[PDB]
């Protein structure tokens, strides 16, 4: 039968126009009182996932 | 459609069993023992094709040695002498001359003694 979209990926990740995979940086969900403004600010950006992990996640999103 | 074995395996086994004609006991009668015997036999033939070139060179050298010692030198002096006289008759032909043309071989001994 047809593949199912992985919804854990669909809720965490996006495929860009050229097929990169972009995610939110980790590490600022909590324990933030003692993190510098630089850590908090830069952890609020998206980042491009490394190629090996990006290819696996794209296989999980066959209909995006 | 279905493709059963049919004739294919019997023909394959008969090719092997024919090659194993003459082998002892099941080595010529059973397809399995024939093929194991053939494996060894093929490696032997390859190895002995190589080894035959050496076997015959040993025999030539032994015969050449004995013909030399009838004229008072040994093989290794005889070969050195031929090298310095520039003579390049090979050991297959030197051994044939030693047996079939003793006059010619004696003159070769002469050339070798003179070259040193």
């Amino acid at each position: 039968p047809k593949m199912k979209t992985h919804k854990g990926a669909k809720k965490r990740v996006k495929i860009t126009a050229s097929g990169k995979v972009v995610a939110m940086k980790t590490g600022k969900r909590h324990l933030n009182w003692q993190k510098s403004g630089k850590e908090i600010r830069q952890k609020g950006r998206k980042f491009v996932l490394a190629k090996p992990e990006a290819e696996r996640i794209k296989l999980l999103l066959p209909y995006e | 459609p279905r493709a059963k074995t049919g004739v294919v395996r019997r023909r394959k086994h008969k090719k092997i069993l024919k090659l194993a004609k003459g082998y002892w006991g099941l080595r010529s009668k059973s397809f399995r023992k024939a093929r194991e015997t053939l494996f060894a036999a093929g490696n032997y033939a390859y190895a002995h094709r190589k080894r035959r070139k050496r076997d015959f060179r040993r025999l030539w050298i032994v015969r050449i040695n004995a013909a030399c010692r009838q004229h008072g030198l040994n093989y290794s002096t005889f070969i050195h002498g031929l090298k310095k006289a520039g003579i390049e008759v090979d050991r297959k032909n030197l051994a044939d001359l030693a047996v079939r043309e003793p006059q010619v071989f004696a003159e070769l001994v002469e050339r070798a003694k003179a070259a040193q």
């Binding site: 854990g8 809720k11 965490r12 990740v13 939110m24 996932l49 696996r56 996640i57 296989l59 | -």
Partner: protein
Amino acid sequence: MKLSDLRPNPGANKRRKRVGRGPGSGHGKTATRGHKGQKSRSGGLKDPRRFEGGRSTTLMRLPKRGMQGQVPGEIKRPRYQGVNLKDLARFEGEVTPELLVRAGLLKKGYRLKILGEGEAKPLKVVAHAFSKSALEKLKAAGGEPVLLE
């Protein structure tokens, strides 16, 4: 030309890879599977796209972000598809949603929005919206923007 002349081009019909059929083939015995382990087994591995041998996976360690929605689901609202001026160059006279839908430019169930890539034409262009620049370019070119609701 007869049936005994009908042939695929070179490479149009390749032979398959048959494993486990003898030493000479290069694929005998282990059938290109290597020796033991979970991957050689009939049934094989867990999904390589996700599983990582028991550790928390690359994907599950990334944070969720955004509205995921709730039952009873997607809120029905009007949706827009952009169509650039350059795509309108083939038309004459009066372009409308139904027309762009026909030519394969606009998708059914989408309101039309004109965007400003390319060059405007002197056309009567009926649409549900226009970008700022698509308005500029269309006015300046002599075309007529008609705005539906």
